Ligand binder design. Structure first.
Ligand SMILES: CCCCCCCCCCCCCCCC(=O)OC[C@@H](O)COP(=O)([O-])OC[C@H](O)CO
Length: 93
């Protein structure tokens, strides 16, 4: 497992670019790597994603476009097509 508070917090500086703002900024990428670097386990990734998935539902300016390219533009391994409708609960490590 992991700390949900750390999941969304790590995307603090990313929220901007994720909300349609400019980016991904250099300060944002820093957290993205730390967040993904932590989710090395199965139960760690499921919670991490789900955590952001819920906190994203309460957002109206959420730009799914910046969310998918967020980890990509930051040079990160993610063969996933990034789908907010995807069940992160059925994901492995
Ligand atoms: C790291 C693992 C892979 C990530 C997969 C990425 C694909 C999904 C990305 C979809 C977008 C999710 C992120 C939304 C941005 C965000 O979560 O901001 C955090 C902020 O809204 C606070 O979240 P909270 O602490 O849960 O606060 C919730 C409160 O209801 C909001 O008013």
């Amino acid at each position: 497992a992991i700390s949900c508070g750390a999941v969304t917090s790590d995307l603090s500086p990313c929220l901007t670019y994720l909300t349609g703002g400019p980016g991904p900024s250099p300060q944002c990428c820093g957290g993205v790597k730390k967040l993904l670097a932590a989710a090395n386990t199965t139960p760690d990734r499921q919670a991490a994603c789900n955590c952001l998935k819920s906190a994203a539902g309460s957002i109206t300016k959420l730009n799914t476009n910046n969310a998918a390219a967020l980890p990509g533009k930051c040079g990160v391994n993610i063969p996933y097509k990034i789908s907010t409708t995807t069940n992160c609960n059925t994901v492995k490590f």
